[PDB]
């Protein structure tokens, strides 16, 4: 077994990123803006 | 201006020159009350209007 397969380096690390966005198209099937006010506001 | 500007955010003020709208709608009301009272009344009486012969001494 390789060291890389069972060990991680101290400086090497991942982070999590989150964001809000909109998706266009969809041939319908999108959000119901009446029940999703934030969609129309954005 | 070359600054970055988000698309979906609520366009809040972010820098020195940014402008914001303020709705005052201020309403304050405070009240305070206090009271105290004290009444004392007394009235005593005593009279014979007729004294027995044996009690006339006192
Ligand atoms: C918490 C309890 C603690 C205990 C308290 C103890 C008692 C606390 C004390 C309570 C009694 C008050 C004392 C009053 C006299 C006194 O000292 O304080 C006066 C100033 C007031 C200060 C009081 C502040 C107290 C501060 C408050 C304190 C409260 C605590 C100075 C004074 O002296 N002023 C004085 C002066 O005025 P002037 O300055 O101007 O000169 O002279 C004029 C003219 O004198 C009169 O002339 C008449 C002829 O003209 C002549 O008749 P004649 O026959 O000769 O003709 C006639 O002779 C006569 O009565 C002839 C004969 C009458 C017999 C008839 C049968 C009655 C029986 C009646 C039986 C009574 C039944 C209780 O006598 C007596 O045997 C009297 C009976 C004695 C009973 C003894 C009790 C045995 C226990 C029997 C116990 C019974 C068991 C069931 C001449 N009378 C006198 O000389 C005066 C005096 C002669 C004393 C010689 C006799 C032996 C005393 C021998 C010993 C007495 C010692 C006390 O008699 C009294 O009353 C004495 C009353 C004592 C009662 C005490 C009870 C103790 C309970 C015991 C309890 C422990 C008076 O008018 C005037 O007195 C008056 O006006 C008074 C008025 O009348 C009567 C009003 C009474 C209303 C209730 C008070 C309401 C006041 C309330 C507001 C404050």
UniProtKB/Swiss-Prot annotation, chain A:
- Give its localization: Periplasm; Bacterial flagellum basal body
- The superkingdom of the source organism is Bacteria
What is known about its subunit structure? Answer: The basal body constitutes a major portion of the flagellar organelle and consists of four rings (L,P,S, and M) mounted on a central rod.
What is stated as this protein's family in its record? Belongs to the FlgI family.
Q: What does this protein do, in the record's words? A: Assembles around the rod to form the L-ring and probably protects the motor/basal body from shearing forces during rotation.
Q: What is this protein called?
A: Flagellar P-ring protein
- The gene from which this protein is expressed is flgI
Swiss-Prot record, chain B:
Q: Where in the cell is it found?
A: Cell outer membrane; Bacterial flagellum basal body
Judging by the UniProt lineage, the source's domain of life is Bacteria
So what family is this one in? Belongs to the FlgH family.
Its annotated function is as follows: Assembles around the rod to form the L-ring and probably protects the motor/basal body from shearing forces during rotation.
Q: How does it assemble?
A: The basal body constitutes a major portion of the flagellar organelle and consists of four rings (L,P,S, and M) mounted on a central rod.
Give the protein name, as stated in the record.
Flagellar L-ring protein
Organism this protein belongs to: Salmonella typhimurium (strain LT2 / SGSC1412 / ATCC 700720)
First and last residues shown, out of full length: 59 to 116 of 232
